[PDB]
C-alpha atoms as a printed R data frame, in Angstrom:
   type eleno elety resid chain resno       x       y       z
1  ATOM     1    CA   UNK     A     1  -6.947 -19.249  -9.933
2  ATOM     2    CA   UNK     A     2  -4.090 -16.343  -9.502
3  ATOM     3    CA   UNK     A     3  -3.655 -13.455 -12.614
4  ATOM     4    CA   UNK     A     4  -5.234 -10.502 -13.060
5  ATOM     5    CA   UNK     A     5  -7.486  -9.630 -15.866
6  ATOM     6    CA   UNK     A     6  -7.375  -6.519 -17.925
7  ATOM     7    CA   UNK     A     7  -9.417  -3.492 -17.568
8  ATOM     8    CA   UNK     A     8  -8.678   0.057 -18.359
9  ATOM     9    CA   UNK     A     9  -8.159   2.794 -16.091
10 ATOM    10    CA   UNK     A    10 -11.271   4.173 -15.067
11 ATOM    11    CA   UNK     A    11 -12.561   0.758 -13.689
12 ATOM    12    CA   UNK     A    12  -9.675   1.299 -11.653
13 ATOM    13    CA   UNK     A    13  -8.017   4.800 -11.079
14 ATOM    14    CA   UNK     A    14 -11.066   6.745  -9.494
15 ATOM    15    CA   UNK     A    15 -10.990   5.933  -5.700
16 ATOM    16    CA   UNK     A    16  -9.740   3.247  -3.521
17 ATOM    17    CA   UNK     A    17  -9.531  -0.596  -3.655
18 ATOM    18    CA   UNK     A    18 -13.628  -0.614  -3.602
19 ATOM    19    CA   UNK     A    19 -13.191   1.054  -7.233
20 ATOM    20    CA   UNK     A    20 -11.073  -1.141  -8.937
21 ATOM    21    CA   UNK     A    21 -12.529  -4.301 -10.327
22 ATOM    22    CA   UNK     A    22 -12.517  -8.016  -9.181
23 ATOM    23    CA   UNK     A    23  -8.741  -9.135  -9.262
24 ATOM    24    CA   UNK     A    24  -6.811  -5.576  -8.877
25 ATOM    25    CA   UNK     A    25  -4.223  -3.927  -6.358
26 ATOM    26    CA   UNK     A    26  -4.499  -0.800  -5.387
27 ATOM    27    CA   UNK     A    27  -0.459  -0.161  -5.017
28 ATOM    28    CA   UNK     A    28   0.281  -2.108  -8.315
29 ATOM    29    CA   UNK     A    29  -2.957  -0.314 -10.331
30 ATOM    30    CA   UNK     A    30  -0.499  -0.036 -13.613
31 ATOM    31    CA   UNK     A    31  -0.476  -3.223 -13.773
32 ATOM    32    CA   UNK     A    32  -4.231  -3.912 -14.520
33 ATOM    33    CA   UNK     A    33  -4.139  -1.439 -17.000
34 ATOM    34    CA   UNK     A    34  -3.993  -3.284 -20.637
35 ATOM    35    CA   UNK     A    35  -0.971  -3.022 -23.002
36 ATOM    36    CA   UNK     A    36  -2.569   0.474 -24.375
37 ATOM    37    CA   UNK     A    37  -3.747   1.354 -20.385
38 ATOM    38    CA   UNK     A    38  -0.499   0.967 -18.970
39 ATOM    39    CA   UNK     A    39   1.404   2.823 -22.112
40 ATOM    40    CA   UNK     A    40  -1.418   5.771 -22.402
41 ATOM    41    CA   UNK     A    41  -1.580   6.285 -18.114
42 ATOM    42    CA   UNK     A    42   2.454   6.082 -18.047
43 ATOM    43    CA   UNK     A    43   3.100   7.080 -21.583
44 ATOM    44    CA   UNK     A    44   5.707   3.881 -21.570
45 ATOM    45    CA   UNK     A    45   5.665   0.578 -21.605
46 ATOM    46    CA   UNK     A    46   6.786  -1.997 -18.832
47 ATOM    47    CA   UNK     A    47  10.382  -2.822 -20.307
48 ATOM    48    CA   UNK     A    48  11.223   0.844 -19.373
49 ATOM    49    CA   UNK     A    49   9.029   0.598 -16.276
50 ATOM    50    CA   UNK     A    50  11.864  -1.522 -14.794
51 ATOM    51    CA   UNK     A    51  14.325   1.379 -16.095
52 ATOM    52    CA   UNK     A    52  13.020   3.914 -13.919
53 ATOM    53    CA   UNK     A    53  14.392   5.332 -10.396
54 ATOM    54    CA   UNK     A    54  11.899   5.320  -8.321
55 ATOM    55    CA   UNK     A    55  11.086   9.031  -7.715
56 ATOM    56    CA   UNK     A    56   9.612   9.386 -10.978
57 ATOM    57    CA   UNK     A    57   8.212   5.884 -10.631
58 ATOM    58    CA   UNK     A    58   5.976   7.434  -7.907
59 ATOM    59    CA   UNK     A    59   5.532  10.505  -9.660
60 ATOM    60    CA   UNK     A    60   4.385   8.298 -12.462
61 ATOM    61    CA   UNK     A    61   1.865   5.895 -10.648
62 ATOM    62    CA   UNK     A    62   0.462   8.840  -8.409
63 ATOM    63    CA   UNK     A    63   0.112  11.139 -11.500
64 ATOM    64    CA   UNK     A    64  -3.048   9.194 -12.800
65 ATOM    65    CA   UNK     A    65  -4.198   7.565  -9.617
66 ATOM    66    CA   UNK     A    66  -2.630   4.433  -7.700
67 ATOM    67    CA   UNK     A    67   0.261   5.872  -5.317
Protein backbone atom coordinates (compact mmCIF):
# COMPACT_ATOMS: atom_id res chain seq x y z
CA UNK A 1 0.00 0.00 0.00
CA UNK A 2 1.41 3.75 -0.88
CA UNK A 3 5.35 4.11 -2.48
CA UNK A 4 6.39 4.00 -5.69
CA UNK A 5 8.63 1.45 -7.17
CA UNK A 6 11.62 2.08 -9.31
CA UNK A 7 11.86 1.97 -12.97
CA UNK A 8 14.04 3.82 -15.33
CA UNK A 9 13.13 6.39 -17.67
CA UNK A 10 11.89 4.96 -20.68
CA UNK A 11 9.09 2.97 -18.83
CA UNK A 12 8.22 6.34 -18.02
CA UNK A 13 9.40 9.47 -20.07
CA UNK A 14 7.88 8.57 -23.61
CA UNK A 15 4.21 9.83 -23.54
CA UNK A 16 1.62 10.51 -21.02
CA UNK A 17 0.41 8.90 -17.74
CA UNK A 18 -0.72 5.66 -19.98
CA UNK A 19 3.25 5.26 -20.50
CA UNK A 20 4.54 5.26 -17.25
CA UNK A 21 4.27 2.11 -15.23
CA UNK A 22 1.91 0.93 -12.38
CA UNK A 23 2.57 3.39 -9.37
CA UNK A 24 4.01 6.67 -11.29
CA UNK A 25 3.02 10.50 -11.64
CA UNK A 26 3.20 12.09 -14.51
CA UNK A 27 4.16 15.73 -12.88
CA UNK A 28 6.60 14.09 -10.32
CA UNK A 29 8.21 11.49 -13.23
CA UNK A 30 11.89 12.22 -11.56
CA UNK A 31 10.89 10.74 -8.91
CA UNK A 32 10.33 7.15 -10.28
CA UNK A 33 13.47 7.31 -11.84
CA UNK A 34 16.10 5.10 -9.64
CA UNK A 35 19.10 6.64 -7.79
CA UNK A 36 21.17 6.38 -11.30
CA UNK A 37 17.61 7.48 -13.34
CA UNK A 38 17.05 10.46 -11.48
CA UNK A 39 21.03 11.51 -11.42
CA UNK A 40 21.61 10.48 -15.34
CA UNK A 41 17.91 12.34 -16.57
CA UNK A 42 18.83 15.48 -14.19
CA UNK A 43 22.53 14.99 -14.06
CA UNK A 44 22.05 15.63 -10.01
CA UNK A 45 20.88 14.10 -7.33
CA UNK A 46 17.76 14.97 -5.07
CA UNK A 47 19.73 16.85 -2.17
CA UNK A 48 20.43 19.54 -4.86
CA UNK A 49 16.99 18.97 -6.39
CA UNK A 50 15.64 20.87 -3.35
CA UNK A 51 18.50 23.59 -4.15
CA UNK A 52 17.12 24.59 -7.30
CA UNK A 53 14.83 27.76 -8.30
CA UNK A 54 12.32 26.63 -10.01
CA UNK A 55 12.90 27.90 -13.60
CA UNK A 56 15.56 25.55 -14.15
CA UNK A 57 13.62 23.01 -12.11
CA UNK A 58 11.16 23.06 -15.07
CA UNK A 59 13.72 23.36 -17.53
CA UNK A 60 15.13 20.31 -15.88
CA UNK A 61 11.99 17.97 -15.61
CA UNK A 62 10.67 19.10 -19.17
CA UNK A 63 14.18 18.59 -20.72
CA UNK A 64 13.82 14.67 -20.65
CA UNK A 65 10.08 14.34 -20.48
CA UNK A 66 7.64 14.97 -17.38
CA UNK A 67 6.78 18.89 -17.37
Amino acid sequence: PTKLETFPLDVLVNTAAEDLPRGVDPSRKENHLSDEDFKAVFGMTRSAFANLPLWKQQNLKKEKGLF
